[PDB]
Amino acid sequence: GEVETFAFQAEIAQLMSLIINTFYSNKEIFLRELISNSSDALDKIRYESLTDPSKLDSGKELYIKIIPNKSEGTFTIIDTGIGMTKADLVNNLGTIAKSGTKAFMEALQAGADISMIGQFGVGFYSCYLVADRVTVHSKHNDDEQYMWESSAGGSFTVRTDHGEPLGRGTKIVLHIKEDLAEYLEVNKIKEIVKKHSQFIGYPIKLTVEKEREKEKKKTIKEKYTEDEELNKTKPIWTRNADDITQEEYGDFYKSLTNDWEDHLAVKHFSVEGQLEFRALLFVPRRAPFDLFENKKRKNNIKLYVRRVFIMDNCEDLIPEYLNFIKGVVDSEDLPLNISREMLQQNKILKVIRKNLVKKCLELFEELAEDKENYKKYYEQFSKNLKLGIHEDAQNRTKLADLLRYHTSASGDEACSLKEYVSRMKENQKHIYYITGENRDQVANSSFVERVKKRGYEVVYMTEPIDEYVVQQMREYDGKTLVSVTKEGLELPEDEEEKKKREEDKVKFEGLCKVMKNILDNKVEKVVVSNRLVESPCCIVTAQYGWSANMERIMKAQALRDTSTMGYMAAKKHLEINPDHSIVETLRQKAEADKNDKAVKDLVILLYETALLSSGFTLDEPQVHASRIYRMIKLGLGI
Amino acid sequence: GEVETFAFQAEIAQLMSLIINTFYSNKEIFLRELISNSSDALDKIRYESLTDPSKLDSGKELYIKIIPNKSEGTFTIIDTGIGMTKADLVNNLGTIAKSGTKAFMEALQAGADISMIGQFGVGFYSCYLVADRVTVHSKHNDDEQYMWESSAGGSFTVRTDHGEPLGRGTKIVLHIKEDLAEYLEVNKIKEIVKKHSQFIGYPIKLTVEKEREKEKKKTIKEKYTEDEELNKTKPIWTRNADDITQEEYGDFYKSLTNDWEDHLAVKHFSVEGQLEFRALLFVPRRAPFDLFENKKRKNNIKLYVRRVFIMDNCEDLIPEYLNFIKGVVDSEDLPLNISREMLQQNKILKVIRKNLVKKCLELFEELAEDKENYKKYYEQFSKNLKLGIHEDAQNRTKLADLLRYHTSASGDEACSLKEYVSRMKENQKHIYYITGENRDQVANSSFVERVKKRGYEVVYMTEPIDEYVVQQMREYDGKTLVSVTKEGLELPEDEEEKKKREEDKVKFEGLCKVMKNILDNKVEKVVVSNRLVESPCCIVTAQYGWSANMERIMKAQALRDTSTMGYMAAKKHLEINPDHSIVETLRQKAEADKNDKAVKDLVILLYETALLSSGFTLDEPQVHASRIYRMIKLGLGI
Amino acid sequence: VDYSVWDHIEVSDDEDETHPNIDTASLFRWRHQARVERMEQFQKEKELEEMRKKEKSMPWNVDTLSKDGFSKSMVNTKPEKTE
Amino acid sequence: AIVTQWCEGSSLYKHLHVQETKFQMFQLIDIARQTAQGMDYLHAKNIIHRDMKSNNIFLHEGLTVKIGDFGLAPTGSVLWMAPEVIRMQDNNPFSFQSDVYSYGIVLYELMTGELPYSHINNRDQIIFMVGRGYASPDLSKLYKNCPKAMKRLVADCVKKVKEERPLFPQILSSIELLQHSLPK
Ligand SMILES: Nc1ncnc2c1ncn2[C@@H]1O[C@H](COP(=O)(O)OP(=O)(O)OP(=O)(O)O)[C@@H](O)[C@H]1O
Ligand SMILES: Nc1ncnc2c1ncn2[C@@H]1O[C@H](COP(=O)(O)OP(=O)(O)OP(=O)(O)O)[C@@H](O)[C@H]1O
Ligand SMILES: [Mg+2]
Ligand SMILES: [Mg+2]
């Protein structure tokens, strides 16, 4: 055995094609890397000045300038950074997968308090995505100005420069491809800078050709106007929160969201450890008109690493019910892909996701102590809190305390469940709630008669979503959620009340059979009501069937499946008031004659009224209407 | 000037680190690349033998064999493909960005049947994602057996191999890192192969732990497991449609979807031209029970390029109303990124989306010609058709013809709209439709009284989604969709009818005014009804306002604020029947006495009844119920 | 560019790993309870050289990956429908 | 615009012991298949269930079946609990094959429509026999149209020897071969 050892090799020509065509999906990202490298150079020149100010003798202004020119199709970037020596330019620009920035950091001491962007050493070549020929002008203080040029053909040319003395920094010149001329339109440059480089550490200038008359009309027209407001919004999340005024937060929110109104609140927090990031969140004052619209974007939380933009709408970072949250997040250690678009470990997103939800819940908890503002918050975003109940089973308990409702004793004020339990008697074990369309309907229902007359407070449900939330919200603070519209509504009664009820059953036993055989199929059982006081009869629902308001909501959804609606359809029970005069008269008449047609008509009409009073829609409104038309003919004498 | 030319260079170690950590998010891809390369070698020897049959004298069986070894932690891949010469070995494994396969097709002339996938020359290095050291046994027909070994440390070792004779092919042995024993799990391997390389055209045998039932006289059975194929399901889409029978399609569909029933129908096709791809489509016989559950995979068409899996769901393939479609798509020309996990050009996808939507519409059109199968299809997927009406703006025209509905004269069988166009009266100009909750409730409505008596066919509307359709489906074949539940219901009238109408208006004008005074704001106006015979009065809606069912549907939604949408809610108009005895007698009473308490009680009771017969809810059921309870006391003399 | 640190992450409430015939909330709760159980038995077993290796090889989780760097939360006082 | 729907369902226990819905033979077989699949995925992720019963499994909308549905989205009920769990002898008698026995009682409910050991009104007496091996699910009460493969499968699942109860992939394999022979 004789072993031969060889080192790995690389094909330059194929590598160029790979990095050009298979690395970057989006063409516009070419500008991000150029601005990143310019910021790299500016940070380099700045840092050495901290030890030797004489470095800035060649120039004291730290800036970046973008000078598009449609006439020659040249997109030129000039910055005043460290610059290049000949050794530096050859070693960095000629060597793929070699980054001078990484070597520079590894040369610096521990704890330099400067973090930089590029590490892979291939971001620069992304300029070839839109440029066919690259010329670079650079000048280091310890060297002369040189010329760098390549056409991505596997070779590059380097020569000395005798042109205008740039002083210090770098001048990148890209000859744009013919069909990529859209990037010369100033609007897209502003959009790209705001989207990706909104928060760079140095001001970026933009020189635009707006006027064509040069120093002509009455006034002096200037061909170029220097535009500075490209990165004016400084990243306040970088500063300590204790030194930020509320006006600063409002200005940042207005700049980011283009809102004319201020925020409702600001949540700021950072995270330290292996996964380190900073976050700044805002709550808009008005609920958007398209908050729950399906065709639109899921989230508005923007992701940043080392102040560069990565992903705008990442579905993995927040759930749906918190989509209204506005803010940005910046990190420093996220492992990026070759294009700095995704993460090489997607489960990192689900780790950031877990903490931000908790922070948003804490912020919403911090709003409740001020009732006035929390009232506006509830008005604007009642649905989002409720929608989170049904899906976020993890945070259901905490989100429950953030709920407010009208009650039978709260008046026009919305009251929390905590107030509701705090106002309850010692003997009551359940939260009595009623679902419906409006507060007055549920207040005036015949079911709440005995409930109200015995002094037990009842919550009023008026929104359609209330039926969904109470499905999971079976009990709050150990108190069961009991709807009085269902059967088995238990009220604490004395021995005399039980004896009177039993006497009612034994007196009305045969009459209940008379009703049951008269109605046939429409009612499963007729029983003496323990919830009515004045109204003769009412329709109550089964213990585990759908409630009256529930099935109407179910029957009105456009996309639900009808194969199952047979199973949970509740069975109708007809409760009868023992002490009503009409029921006593009907009892006497039925005892006199079991076959009275008039008694049959009265029973059918009374049940039809009972369905309407209980909220059930009539199986056929026409027959009830015909019965009432027949009756008023008798009352008038037709 | 002195111009120096230099060729671009690369750093090997940093390039290796980039390939390892930056290009692949998930580690499981290393199996995909290995299977791809083994299939490449197998196709190489196959094509060579197509010209020289003696090439296979070293081995006749073409396959890939996997030999996981949990004891040594060695994941052994053995395929009987083409071997390596020493020059090929070094040039293919030591050179980054060099693909011997790419050189292979670049060597081949045009016209050869080639499904090669290996192009970037870097997929082999993905083994280092999970293996610290790569051991390769190779044996070409024209060369001896050699050993190649490296630990990604920038160097590799080459020596002659003198172990077990391989004859021909390649034996890759990976020393998997200690943290990645998951890839030795038989279930994990099966999952990965079925997910990625399920349709490789060569037998893949996976050999695993012993099959011994221990009781020598004891039973031992097989002291290993001989599993012969995991890719049993051949890619039938590659075959022509004419040579595939129904049983083949059923077995293929059951294999992919794990379904126990067969397909309802199959559509198989390819698309040629500037882009080539194949598509095989299945419609299940039963609706998926989670078709509109939004938390999971929206689109269920799997994507393939050159028969290797790319991505399972892209929202740019099918819309939401086509979530039930099952099938796969295979192509040959899409340029993938370096990771092959995402398609760099999204413009193509929209063309594919258009074509697949068109062809699915064609398939649905084919189904309608066979009623019984189409009746099952309509029963199982009626909702999705109507959602396509709502959202698919372009295909609404053809999508509408696929709707079947029960009509007043259709009995129990549902009828298409075109069948309604088969049955106009010559004077009839509008497709009359009525909305409601049940077929019976709309069959005998008071609104359809005159419509039925005049011989005009009507359509019964019972599903909640229907009101969204009539919002969008305004006209069909140039015929308007007019509801009889709204004002302005224009029915062909003769001179006698309009003469009687004017006489009735003159006679009842004062009565109309007095009811307008009594009902005040509850009705916008009172007019004499031109649609009622049996009902003394009914409630109609505005010309452009909601219907009662439509308003119920809007206010029953749980995610919409009714206050914002409330501006559109229709005004209520009371249409009184001129010939009704009740109306005439009430007119006589009102003329005799205008302030009669009996008259006002009768009119308010009549309006409350007319609300119910019109599908509207009562503003307070309790007061109406109390009105009945008071009245029937008079009947009982209470 | 070593990315080996982050490749070991376990997140329970992940919708991507869900089964259509299992209640998603119940599965998430089951995963969470399993996580709680494994870290609680691990510390009891902790209270040895082989013990030292498995802690370094555990998938990082939300609780252990990082800690809070405290910042301020505020409420914006501005008159709604001002005079 | 259109809005969404969400997760609501009802249990097998209510459906069959209260509503007594007449599930078709293929429907019962489909519930068997989906329950077996959901069990296998639970076991595929080395997860153990300890309170299998018709109460803890729900029929969702579209006849979706969701295990873990404690509600619409072992408290007695020993008729499903396996005998080796009942004696409480082992510190943790809960196992995959105990779940096999419980799911076999689930198939007993599917193919009989009545609780096992119905002739007994005492729970502790049921405890005493089924724990000691005196009582077995009465397999004669299965429906008359019962295919033989499922009958043998439920027999295997209710076999008192925990090791003999075949492991869930074998259950699913047994169902699919019979399931493809259903149209007979
Ligand atoms: N304006 C500049 N200022 C300083 N160095 C520069 C500049 N432009 C290019 N370079 C050097 O040339 C190499 C440029 O490329 P690239 O932009 O390819 O690398 P990076 O920015 O360092 O890494 P990454 O590819 O991860 O972004 C850089 O790594 C840097 O050393
Ligand atoms: N088992 C094998 N049989 C035959 N050739 C092989 C095998 N393994 C590696 N090679 C050769 O090594 C060269 C490199 O391939 P790698 O597998 O490195 O990338 P690719 O298959 O060439 O392309 P891609 O990187 O796009 O997947 C390949 O082009 C192939 O010719
Ligand atoms: Mg770079
Ligand atoms: Mg490869």
Author numbering:
A (entry chain B), B (entry chain A): 10 to 224, 267 to 689
C (entry chain D): 2 to 48, 102 to 137
D (entry chain C): 418 to 490, 505 to 615
The authors write:
Utilizing signal subtraction, focused classification, Bayesian polishing, and CTF refinement, we obtained a 3.7 Å closed state map (see “Methods” for details). The C-lobe of the RAF1 KD is located on one side of the HSP90 dimer, forming both luminal and peripheral interactions with HSP90. The unfolded β5-strand interacts with residues present on the src-loops and HH of both protomers of HSP90, and exhibits amphipathic characteristics that complement the amphipathic nature of the luminal cavity. The CDC37 HxN motif, a structural element, interacts with the C-lobe β7 and αE by mimicking the RAF1 N-lobe. In our structure, there is density supporting the assignment of phosphoserine (pS13), a structural element of CDC37. Among peripheral interactions, notable salt bridges form between R611 (HH in HSP90-B), and RAF1 residues, E425 and E478.
RAF kinases are integral to the RAS-MAPK signaling pathway, and proper RAF1 folding relies on its interaction with the chaperone HSP90 and the cochaperone CDC37. The stability, subcellular localization, activity, and MAPK signaling of RAF1 depend on its interaction with molecular chaperone HSP903. HSP90 and its homologs function as dimers, wherein each protomer has three structural domains.
